[PDB]
């Protein structure tokens, strides 16, 4: 939900989908590990014992054995990791059945938020800026370059589309916690899916260099429950 | 729950969705050309375009529609 | 060639009595100028021809 | 055309028989080469008024 | 002395000035990646006084530096001029004043670099210069222009200077040496001339386009004329990947050369060499984008280019596989060259290894943009073709110089570059997997930890390429004292066991290239009468 | 006319540079090199304003 | 010829070029190319005569360069077999990249036109936009270069078979062909109701055809370069490789534009 000092592995997963990345990078460390062992020991054993050895052998110059067999293993290994890899890539880019969608529009430093499903009793369109709080407004206690002006409120357990654009130059809709990632392109529209398993608050940032304020366009989502997320819906 | 928004639709399957929000309001407009501005089953197209619609994007058509420039084939 | 290019002659003299009150209304992508060119009055292009292409 | 061979004659700076010591080229020249994006800076923070 | 260094016709003096000019532009890369590494030490402003424009613009000096003006000019430029000649039997280049501009377009094109970054703001936009931040409205002013030229003149340097390696090797090798004879090092250069032909023609239709919408009303890429930013992506792409490998193979060629040498064994599978450099080089055009997974393009799309990617895998491990076959069984000799491409094994195997993560286009989603990508990249071009590089300079300088360098003070040399490289890249994966965005100047507070620590391995670095300089000043002052005092290696192969000192003094090279033959500093006219093998 | 082998025998017995061996060689080189100086210094007499932001007053 | 006499001449056929200033010359035009353009589209400089004289120096410098290929060639004897094949295949790869440049403008157009964005009416061409029709002077381009490759064909015959007065007026019409069509590109642009303004559509139109046609020129610099040749005999029945580069160049141009006209003129409109 948020980075730790010194931290070096994933941030805790809320989505089935940032559930499978990370299953997918630990199955594919598995084998370069494997292979990082062999080589690195191979080298080491090589130097140790032939730095000492007074006659060379220089006749051996080739072998159909080992060279047929050290070009069908990685083969295999890249085989064994490429199913799992096809399954989480169409699993990750269905969109099926959501009960929400929320647009999210990049500008020159700020993000923007718009509900327009008219779900709210009076049926318009929900809508609103999000800014960083600059340094010399931050309360004591706030996180610096992390936390907004406004975030976006959305309910757990529920299936959510967000949509993704931008007005000016590219940018890049990103919450690690969430498992999304995608560009934000001036003229075209590209979609995402996410469920939430859990409340609490998940940040993210900008990822598409978008000139001297890229370092000052932060994310953050609350989730919340469902009749939290009504109230919420219905005065703002 | 009291949540809905628009589904799955198998013309446009893909992440890139341009083409739904515009085909949509396109439909819309010439639905109501014909068949009247009031027409039960025209509200279909309606929800879709504004469910996953940037407003700004709305607000230059409705300009370019006033002076007779918008490029979509309505009339 | 002489015969269709001699037709398009006459239906450029038809344009050149043309005002510029019914000169149709650009669309959003034409005659973009995101500044103007650097030559002349900034306005016109190269191959710039009055009868057929005009910034209104 | 005809050129000569030896040890310091591939080169096209003089190392030997000169009357400033060779460290004055040696160390100046890359002296420079480290000191462009210096001047860069100083250029442009006195642009932005920062001095 | 006017006439032989500015109307030069010979490859041997031209390979000269293109070392030079490799050399000086290293220092201001390096230089521009010390400020870089010292404005991300902690959090806050820190020297550049809040500029982040500023910040930007040293970040695309410094990729371009580090390309485009040292490492092609020198493994290229510089080796391949010098040695390519020498090691079939040339005389000269074919075309010598084509082999001419293509040296002089260099010192201009870094006149009009150094310019950019001096007038109105610079360019902060990235070396893959992407629209629209990239167009007058993001960036206005003459600085993008003046970046645009720069790369156009270093693409009339690459092609002209490819042209010629190519009519070179198969025009003009001498009596007896077929296809199949040439040294590896021949056919790496050879390899690398066709990537570079069928590349830069589609890089110079990208930039030039660029060029068009910011000054001549042109609509590309422009989104309110119909145009498309991904497009110039595509294209920028299509060049970009085919590059790193015009990058690696001509490091590969140096490697294969130092291993056998210091091993006193001929390389294993020699002809399955060539074929994979071969394949490497057709399938580095079909993975362009794999470097656009989160662009938006298609689910099919996307699967078909994680297992083109993956395959790549395949050749380049049947090339890691052969050079240890190589080194086993052999006797094996220290020398610093033999040093650094011991580690060129072990540090290049890890940089690949990270990128076989990146190739699956289902786990790029947590890999975009992320420091995890700018650590796989210095593994692979800064502990690769920069080791490559040292390993090449200590190889051949001897003989094309006549001097010797002082052999105790490269060991030192080479193992403060390994201990500082290790230490600014390998915490750059902990921060990208932990989820650090790049091309910031500032960041939330957590990732302070890992920032400290890469920052001073980045003085560690710059300390050990600053006794390098004097490495180069005591070897011209003192190089002809290097061979007759114990302070330098005066044989990269020693005698045989059963051979004794005075048998090994009637041939005292045992060599499989020919330029181990000649004078130590090689004749301005190597070959009247031409060489002749079986 | 023919004058292959006249121009044949001139070039081969020369000293001079290759550029400078033709009889008529002084008509163009001599002006050439002016000119070359001049298309080459003027645009560097233009760094100091562009650095200074100062825009030539064509208007 | 014994030894003594022998040890006169070279041993090897490879050409061994002497210094010449033109390389480091052309790249000081090239600089001073690169920095007038910039600031001159920006403001910095008040006209355009500072281009225009670097566009000058950069023509004339490399014309000096082409004058010494021409005496080492045919007044002092340095172009052997292998020097001759060598230039013909470093002239093979030279049209191959250009070939390639033309590959990037195919893409950019098919990219644009296959699925056309909504702002132009997701339709190609776009709306509003009269394009050129194919039946027209677009159809007398395609019939005029079609027939200097036949010209040139009987013109290059008539050179191997010792027929003068034929080569020489199989050459002055293949001229005045390719100088045919430069002018009636010219012609087909100042009327066309449509610019490089007009959106993507007159971008990827006019840079296609309008490279194409800057190479044209460049294509009618050479007959008329190899016509001077001709006709003062520096050209032999055996030996005139100024003039193979020329054919070789004459008909990739012309699969080119024959491309260009399927797929701009047939199928895009
Ligand atoms: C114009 C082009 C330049 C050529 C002529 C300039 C000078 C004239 C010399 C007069 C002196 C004299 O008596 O000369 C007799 C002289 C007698 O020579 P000779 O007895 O045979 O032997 C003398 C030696 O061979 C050598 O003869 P030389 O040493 O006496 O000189 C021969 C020639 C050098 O010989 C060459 O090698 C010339 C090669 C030039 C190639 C031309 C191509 C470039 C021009 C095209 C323009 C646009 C292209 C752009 C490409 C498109 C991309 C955007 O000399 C020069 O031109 C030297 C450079 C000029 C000086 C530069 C400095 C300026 C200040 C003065 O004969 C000539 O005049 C030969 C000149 C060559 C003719 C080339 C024909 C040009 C091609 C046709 C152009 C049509 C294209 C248009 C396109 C259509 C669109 C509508
Ligand atoms: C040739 C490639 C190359 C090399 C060598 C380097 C070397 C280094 N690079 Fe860089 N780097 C890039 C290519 C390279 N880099 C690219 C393409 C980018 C991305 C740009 C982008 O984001 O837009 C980048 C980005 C990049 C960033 C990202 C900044 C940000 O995102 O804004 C950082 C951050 O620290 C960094 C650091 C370093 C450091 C500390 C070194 C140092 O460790 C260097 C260590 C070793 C040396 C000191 C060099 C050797 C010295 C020589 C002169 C060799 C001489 C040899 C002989 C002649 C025999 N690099
Ligand atoms: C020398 C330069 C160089 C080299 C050689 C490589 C080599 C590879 N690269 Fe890299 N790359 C860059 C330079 C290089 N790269 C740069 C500069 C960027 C960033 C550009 C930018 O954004 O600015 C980049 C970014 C980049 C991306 C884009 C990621 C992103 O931007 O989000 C990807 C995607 O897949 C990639 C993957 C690979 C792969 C699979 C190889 C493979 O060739 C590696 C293969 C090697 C091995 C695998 C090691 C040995 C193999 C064996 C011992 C066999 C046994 C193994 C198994 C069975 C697994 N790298
Ligand atoms: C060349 C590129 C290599 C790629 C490596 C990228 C990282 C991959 C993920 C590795 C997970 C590390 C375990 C986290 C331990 C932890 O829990 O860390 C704990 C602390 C701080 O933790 P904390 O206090 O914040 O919280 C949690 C408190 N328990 O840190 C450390 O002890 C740093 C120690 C470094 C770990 C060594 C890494 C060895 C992996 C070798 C990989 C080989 C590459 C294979 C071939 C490419
Ligand atoms: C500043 C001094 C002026 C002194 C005043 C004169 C009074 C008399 C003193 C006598 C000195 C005469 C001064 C003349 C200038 C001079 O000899 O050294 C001055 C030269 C400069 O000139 P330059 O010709 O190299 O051009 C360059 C001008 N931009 O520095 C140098 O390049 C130092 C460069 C050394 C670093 C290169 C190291 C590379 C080694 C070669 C290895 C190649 C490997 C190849 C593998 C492919
Ligand atoms: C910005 C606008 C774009 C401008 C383009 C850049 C201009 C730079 C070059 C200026 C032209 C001067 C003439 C030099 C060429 C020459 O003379 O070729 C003639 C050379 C001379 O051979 P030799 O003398 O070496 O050997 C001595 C033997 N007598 O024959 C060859 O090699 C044979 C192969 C011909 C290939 C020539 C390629 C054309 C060069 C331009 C390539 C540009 C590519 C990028 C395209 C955008
Ligand atoms: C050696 C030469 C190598 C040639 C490269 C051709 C290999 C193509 C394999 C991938 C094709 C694919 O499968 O591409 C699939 C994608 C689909 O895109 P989409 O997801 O948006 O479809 C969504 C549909 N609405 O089409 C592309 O991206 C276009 C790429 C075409 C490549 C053009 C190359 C032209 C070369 C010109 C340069 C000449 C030098
Ligand atoms: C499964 C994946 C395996 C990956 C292995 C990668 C390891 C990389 C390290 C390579 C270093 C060893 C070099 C190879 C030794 C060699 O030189 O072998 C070549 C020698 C030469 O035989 P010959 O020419 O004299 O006779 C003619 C022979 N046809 O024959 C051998 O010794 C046999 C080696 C045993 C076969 C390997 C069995 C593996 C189980
Ligand atoms: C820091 C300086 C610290 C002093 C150390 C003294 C060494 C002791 C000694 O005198 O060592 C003697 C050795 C000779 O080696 P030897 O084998 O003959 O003697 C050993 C007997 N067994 O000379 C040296 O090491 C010289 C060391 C130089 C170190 C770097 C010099 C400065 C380089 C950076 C400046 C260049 C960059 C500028 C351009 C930007
Ligand atoms: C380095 C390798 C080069 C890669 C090049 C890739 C892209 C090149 C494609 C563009 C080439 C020039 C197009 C022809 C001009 C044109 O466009 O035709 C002319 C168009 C059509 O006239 P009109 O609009 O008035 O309409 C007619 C209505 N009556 O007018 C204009 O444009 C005016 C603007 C001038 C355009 C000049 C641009 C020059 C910059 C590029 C220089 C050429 C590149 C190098 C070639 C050796
Ligand atoms: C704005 C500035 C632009 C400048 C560009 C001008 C281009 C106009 C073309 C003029 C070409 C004249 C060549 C004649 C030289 C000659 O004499 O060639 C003839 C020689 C002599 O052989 P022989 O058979 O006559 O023997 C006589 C009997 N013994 O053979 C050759 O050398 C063959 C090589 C010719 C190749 C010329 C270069 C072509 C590519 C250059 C492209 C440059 C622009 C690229 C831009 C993208
Ligand atoms: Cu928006 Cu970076
Ligand atoms: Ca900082
Ligand atoms: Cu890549
Ligand atoms: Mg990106």
């Known amino acids: 939900d948020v980075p730790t000092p010194y931290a070096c592995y994933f941030q805790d997963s809320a989505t089935p989908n940032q559930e499978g990345i990370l299953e997918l990078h630990d199955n594919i460390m598995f084998y370069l590990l494997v292979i990082l062992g062999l080589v690195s020991w191979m080298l080491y054993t090589i130097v140790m014992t032939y730095s000492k050895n007074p006659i060379a052998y220089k006749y051996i110059k080739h072998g159909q054995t080992i060279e047929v067999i050290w070009t069908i293993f990685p083969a295999v290994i890249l085989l064994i990791i490429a199913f799992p890899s096809f399954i989480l890539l169409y699993l990750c880019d269905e969109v099926i059945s959501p009960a929400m969608t929320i647009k999210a529009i ?28 600059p340094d010399e407004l931050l309360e004591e206690g706030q996180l610096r370059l992390l936390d907004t002006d406004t975030s976006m409120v959305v309910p757990v357990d529920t299936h959510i589309r967000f949509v993704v654009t931008a007005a000016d130059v590219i940018h890049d809709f990103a919450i690690p916690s969430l498992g999304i990632k995608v560009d934000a392109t001036p003229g075209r529209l590209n979609q995402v899916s996410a469920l939430i398993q859990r409340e609490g608050v998940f940040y993210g940032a900008c990822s598409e260099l978008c000139g001297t304020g890229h370092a000052n366009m932060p994310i953050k989502i609350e989730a919340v429950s469902l009749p939290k997320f009504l109230e919420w819906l219905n005065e703002q | 729950s009291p949540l809905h928004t628009v589904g799955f639709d198998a ?12 085909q949509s309001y396109v439909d819309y407009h010439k639905c109501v050309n014909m068949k009247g501005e009031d027409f039960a089953p025209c509200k279909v197209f309606w929800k879709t375009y504004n469910a996953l619609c940037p407003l700004d994007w709305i ?17 | 060639t002489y015969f269709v290019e001699k037709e398009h002659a006459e239906h450029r003299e038809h344009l050149k009595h043309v005002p510029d009150s019914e000169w149709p209304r650009d669309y959003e992508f034409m005659n973009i100028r995101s500044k103007p060119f650097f030559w002349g009055d900034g306005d016109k292009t190269l191959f710039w021809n009055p009868v057929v292409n005009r910034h209104i | 055309v005809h050129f000569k061979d030896g040890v310091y004659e591939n080169i096209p700076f003089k190392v030997k028989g000169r009357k400033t010591p060779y460290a004055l080229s040696h160390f100046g020249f890359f002296a420079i080469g480290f000191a462009v994006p210096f001047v860069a800076c100083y250029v442009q923070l006195k642009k932005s008024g920062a001095f | 002395m006017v006439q032989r260094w500015l109307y030069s016709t010979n490859a041997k003096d031209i390979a000269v000035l293109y070392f030079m000019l490799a050399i000086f532009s290293g220092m201001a890369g390096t230089a521009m990646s010390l400020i870089i590494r010292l404005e991300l030490a902690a959090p806050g402003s820190q020297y550049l006084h809040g500029n982040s424009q500023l910040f930007n613009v040293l970040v695309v000096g410094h990729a371009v530096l580090m390309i485009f003006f ?64 990239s167009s007058i409205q993001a960036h206005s002013g003459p600085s993008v222009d003046l970046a645009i030229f720069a790369l156009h003149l270093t693409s009339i340097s690459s092609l002209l200077g490819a042209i010629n390696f190519i009519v070179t090797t198969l025009n003009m090798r001498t009596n007896g040496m077929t296809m199949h004879k040439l040294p590896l090092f021949v056919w790496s250069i050879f390899i690398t001339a066709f990537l570079l032909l069928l590349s830069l023609p589609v890089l110079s239709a990208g930039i030039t386009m660029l060029l068009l919408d910011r000054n001549f009303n042109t609509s590309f890429f422009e989104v309110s004329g119909g145009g498309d930013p991904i497009l110039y992506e595509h294209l920028f792409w299509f060049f970009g990947h085919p590059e790193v490998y015009i990058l690696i193979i001509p490091g590969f060629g140096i490697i294969s050369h130092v291993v056998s040498t210091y091993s006193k064994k001929p390389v294993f599978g020699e002809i399955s060499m060539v074929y994979a450099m071969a394949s490497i080089g057709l399938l580095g055009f079909l993975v362009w984008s794999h470097h656009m997974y989160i662009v938006g393009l298609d689910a099919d799309t996307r699967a078909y280019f994680t297992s083109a990617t993956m395959i790549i895998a395949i050749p380049t491990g049947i090339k890691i596989f052969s050079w240890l076959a190589t080194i086993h069984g052999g006797s094996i000799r220290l020398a610093t060259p033999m040093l650094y491409a011991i580690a060129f094994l072990f540090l290049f195997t890890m940089g690949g290894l990270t990128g076989v993560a990146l190739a699956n286009a289902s786990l790029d989603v947590a890999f975009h943009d992320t420091y995890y990508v700018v650590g796989h990249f210095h593994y692979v071009l800064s502990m690769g073709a920069i080791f490559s590089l040292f390993a090449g300079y200590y190889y051949w300088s001897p003989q094309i110089l006549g001097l010797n360098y002082n052999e105790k003070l490269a060991q030192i040399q080479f193992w403060l570059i390994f201990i500082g490289a290790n230490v600014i890249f390998f915490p750059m994966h902990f921060l990208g997997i ?29 300390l050990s390429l600053f006794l390098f300089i004097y490495i180069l000043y005591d070897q011209l002052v003192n190089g002809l004292n290097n061979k007759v005092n114990n302070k330098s290696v005066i044989y990269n192969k020693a005698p045989d066991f059963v051979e004794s000192n005075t048998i090994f003094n009637l041939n005292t090279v045992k060599s499989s290239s020919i330029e181990f033959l000649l004078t130590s500093p090689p004749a301005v006219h190597s070959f009247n009468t031409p060489a002749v093998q079986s | 006319a023919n004058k292959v082998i006249q121009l044949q025998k001139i070039f081969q017995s020369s000293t001079k540079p290759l550029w400078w061996r033709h009889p008529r060689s002084a008509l163009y080189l001599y002006p050439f090199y002016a000119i070359f100086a001049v298309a080459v210094v003027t645009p560097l007499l233009y760094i100091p304003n562009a650095i200074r932001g100062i825009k030539a007053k064509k208007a | 010829m014994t030894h003594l006499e022998r040890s006169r001449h070279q041993q090897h056929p490879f050409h061994m070029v002497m210094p010449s200033p033109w390389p480091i010359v052309v790249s000081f035009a090239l600089l001073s190319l690169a920095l007038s353009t910039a600031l001159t589209m920006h403001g910095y400089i008040g006209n355009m005569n500072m281009v225009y004289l670097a566009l000058f120096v950069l023509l004339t410098s490399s014309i000096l360069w082409f004058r010494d290929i021409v005496a080492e060639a045919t007044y002092l004897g340095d172009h052997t077999m292998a020097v001759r094949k060598g230039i013909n295949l470093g002239f093979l790869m030279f049209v191959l990249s250009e070939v390639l440049i033309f590959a990037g403008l195919f893409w950019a157009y098919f990219h644009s036109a296959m699925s056309p964005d909504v702002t132009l009416g997701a339709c190609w061409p776009p709306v509003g936009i009269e394009a050129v029709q194919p039946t027209e002077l677009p159809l007398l381009n395609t019939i005029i270069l079609l027939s200097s490759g036949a010209t040139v064909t009987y013109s290059h015959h008539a050179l191997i078979a010792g027929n003068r007065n034929k080569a020489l007026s199989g050459l002055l019409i293949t001229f005045w062909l390719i100088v ?26 006019y840079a296609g055809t309008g490279l194409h046609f800057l190479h044209m020129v460049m294509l009618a610099a050479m007959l008329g370069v190899n016509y001077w040749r001709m006709r003062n005999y520096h050209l032999t029945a055996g030996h005139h490789v100024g003039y193979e580069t020329t054919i070789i160049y004459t008909h990739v141009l012309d699969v080119i534009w024959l491309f260009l006209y399927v797929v701009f003129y047939w199928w895009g409109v």
């Not at chain 2, 893909?14 to 739904?20: D, E, I, L, M």
């Not at chain 5, 010192?107 to 629209?131: D, H, I, K």
Request: glycine share 10%; hydrophobic share 40%; charged share 15%.
């Open chain 1, 106 to 133: 990049g500008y020159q430093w700020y993000w923007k938020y718009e509900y327009s499903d008219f779900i709210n009793d009076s049926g318009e369109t929900v809508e609103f800026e999000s800014y960083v709080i």
């Open chain 2, 11 to 22: 013309r446009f399957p893909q992440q890139n969705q341009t083409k739904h929000c515009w």
């Open chain 2, 59 to 75: 607000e230059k058509w409705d300009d370019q529609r006033e002076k007779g420039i918008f490029a979509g084939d309505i009339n």
């Open chain 5, 70 to 133: 040292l490492v092609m000019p020198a493994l290229i430029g510089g080796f391949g001029n010098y040695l390519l000649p020498l090691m079939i039997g040339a005389t000269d280049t074919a075309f010598p004043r084509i082999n001419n501009i293509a040296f002089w377009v260099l010192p201009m094109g870094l006149v009009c670099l150094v310019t950019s970054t001096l007038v109105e703001s610079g360019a902060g936009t990235g070396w893959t210069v992407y629209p629209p931040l």
């Open chain 5, 434 to 462: 932990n989820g650090m965005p790049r091309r910031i100047p500032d960041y939330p507070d957590a990732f302070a930890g890992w920032n400290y620590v890469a920052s001073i391995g980045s003085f560690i670095a710059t």
């Open chain 7, 180 to 205: 045919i069509f430069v002018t009636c590109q010219y012609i087909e642009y100042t009327n066309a109701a449509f610019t490089i303004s007009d959106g993507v559509y007159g971008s990827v139109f």
